[PDB]
Amino acid sequence: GKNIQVVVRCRPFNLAERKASAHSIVECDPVRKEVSVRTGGLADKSSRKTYTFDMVFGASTKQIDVYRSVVCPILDEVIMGYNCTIFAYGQTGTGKTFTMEGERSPNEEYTWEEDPLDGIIPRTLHQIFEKLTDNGTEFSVKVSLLEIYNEELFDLLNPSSDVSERLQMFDDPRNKRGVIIKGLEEITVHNKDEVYQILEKGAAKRTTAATLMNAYSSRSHSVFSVTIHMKETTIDGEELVKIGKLNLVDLAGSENIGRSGAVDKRAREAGNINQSLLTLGRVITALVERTPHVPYRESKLTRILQDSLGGRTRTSIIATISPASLNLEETLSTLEYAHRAKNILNKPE
Numbered sequence: 396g397k398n399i400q401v402v403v404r405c406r407p408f409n410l411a412e413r414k415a416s417a418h419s420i421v422e423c424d425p426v427r428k429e430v431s432v433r434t435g436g437l438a439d440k441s442s443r444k445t446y447t448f449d450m451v452f453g454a455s456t457k458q459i460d461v462y463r464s465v466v467c468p469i470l471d472e473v474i475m476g477y478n479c480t481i482f483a484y485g486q487t488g489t490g491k492t493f494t495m496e497g498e499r500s501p502n503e504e505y506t507w508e509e510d511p512l513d514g515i516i517p518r519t520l521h522q523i524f525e526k527l528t529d530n531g532t533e534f535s536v537k538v539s540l541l542e543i544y545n546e547e548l549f550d551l552l553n554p555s556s557d558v559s560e561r562l563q564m565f566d567d568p569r570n571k572r573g574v575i576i577k578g579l580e581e582i583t584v585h586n587k588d589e590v591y592q593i594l595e596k597g598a599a600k601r602t603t604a605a606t607l608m609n610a611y612s613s614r615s616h617s618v619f620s621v622t623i624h625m626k627e628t629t630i631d632g633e634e635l636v637k638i639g640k641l642n643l644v645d646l647a648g649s650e651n652i653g654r655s656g657a658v659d660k661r662a663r664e665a666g667n668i669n670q671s672l673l674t675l676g677r678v679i680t681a682l683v684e685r686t687p688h689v690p691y692r693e694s695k696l697t698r699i700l701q702d703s704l705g706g707r708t709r710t711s712i713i714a715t716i717s718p719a720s721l722n723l724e725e726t727l728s729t730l731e732y733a734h735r736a737k738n739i740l741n742k743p744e
């Protein structure tokens with residue numbers, strides 16, 4: 396089913412990897428939607444595995460390419476009144492956060508909205524304001540940013556929370572698929588430029604969080620949500636009301652998720668964070684295969700996203716990998732995970 400998409404983004408070789416003279420073991424064919432990884436020893440050319448996805452982005456792919464292929468078709472649905480999710484999944488250091496958030500280009504050269512290094516979040520907020528303005532619709536934008544760490548929920552947008560008070564999740568009595576997270580702060584964004592300070596405060600609150608908690612931000616899931624209340628009036632009479640929602644999910648690093656058949660796999664995958672990643676896999680698979688049992692309850696992440704994941708929706712996963720020999724096992728495990736989420740057969744060579 397086309398409503399759930401799985402894509403892979405390979406990042407360029409970094410400086411660490413080039414100074415270790417790491418080998419480049421990954422090949423991405425965009426046209427064939429294939430990613431092939433040399434799986435064997437230093438000299439073994441013959442030995443390679445191939446996987447097929449909805450899309451594949453090689454190392455020269457820029458932020459804009461990712462946004463237009465993956466994001467923009469989804470944003471169209473959100474603005475049409477739906478509730479949609481995009482995940483970034485992958486080993487620590489592979490670009491989950493670069494993809495979701497992005498970076499500032501050097502010197503002064505860009506307004507934040509025009510910076511080509513922008514990731515999904517800034518691009519999305521920019522487009523919501525620009526597009527709804529051009530359409531003449533009346534709208535408002537609200538945002539919240541929830542972090543998940545050791546099963547505890549944290550609001551990163553609460554200035555006065557300060558800091559590490561945990562929120563409380565309840566089933567929503569008025570929504571069978573919904574939860575209410577008690578005291579989660581949804582900030583209203585009156586003017587597009589305000590997101591910058593809101594999120595800059597979020598980052599400082601996030602930096603603080605790292606100073607007390609163990610391996611924070613590699614082990615945490617971050618859920619950014621934008622809700623848009625929109626009102627249009629048609630040519631003849633009608634006032635029209637729609638609520639769209641977009642979840643942008645930067646997942647805990649996948650480094651301890653094993654490939655199948657791995658020696659120590661159970662031991663490595665122990666702990667709440669690793670199991671939440673696996674639970675998510677199960678939910679996605681069950682949604683793709685359309686099996687009746689989809690286990691949303693077995694993690695906090697999937698309880699929070701159930702409402703989005705289970706409706707008339709678009710859901711994409713961006714699986715980020717390193718090109719390097721330093722990363723081989725983690726890259727293969729990421730591809731296996733992505734492949735298990737949505738099973739796409741290799742086309743004939």
Ligand SMILES: Cc1ccc(C(=O)N(CCCN)[C@@H](c2oc3cc(Cl)ccc3c(=O)c2Cc2ccccc2)C(C)C)cc1
Nearest residue numbers: 496497498499507510513516517590591594595597598601
């Ligand atoms: C053009 C640009 C791109 C990235 C940044 C940046 O480095 N940020 C900090 C986080 C980098 N991983 C931005 C940023 O911070 C976030 C903090 C949290 Cl807690 C969650 C998401 C973001 C995020 O998406 C961004 C990127 C951004 C968002 C809105 C406007 C401009 C940039 C600024 C708002 C400081 C600043 C400017």
Ligand SMILES: Nc1ncnc2c1ncn2[C@@H]1O[C@H](COP(=O)(O)OP(=O)(O)O)[C@@H](O)[C@H]1O
Nearest residue numbers: 405406407485486487488489490491492493494
């Ligand atoms: N597509 C990319 N192009 C260039 N640099 C990238 C890319 N993806 C990640 N990086 C860089 O690699 C480092 C780690 O990326 P990050 O997004 O923090 O990974 P993760 O969030 O998956 O741990 C950062 O310095 C980031 O700037």
Ligand SMILES: [Cl-]
Nearest residue numbers: 418436437720
């Ligand atoms: Cl090697």
Ligand SMILES: [Cl-]
Nearest residue numbers: 467468470471
């Ligand atoms: Cl469009």
Ligand SMILES: [Cl-]
Nearest residue numbers: 677689690693
């Ligand atoms: Cl199960």
Ligand SMILES: [Cl-]
Nearest residue numbers: 674677690693
């Ligand atoms: Cl189970």
Ligand SMILES: [Co+2]
Nearest residue numbers: 422423453454
């Ligand atoms: Co490539």
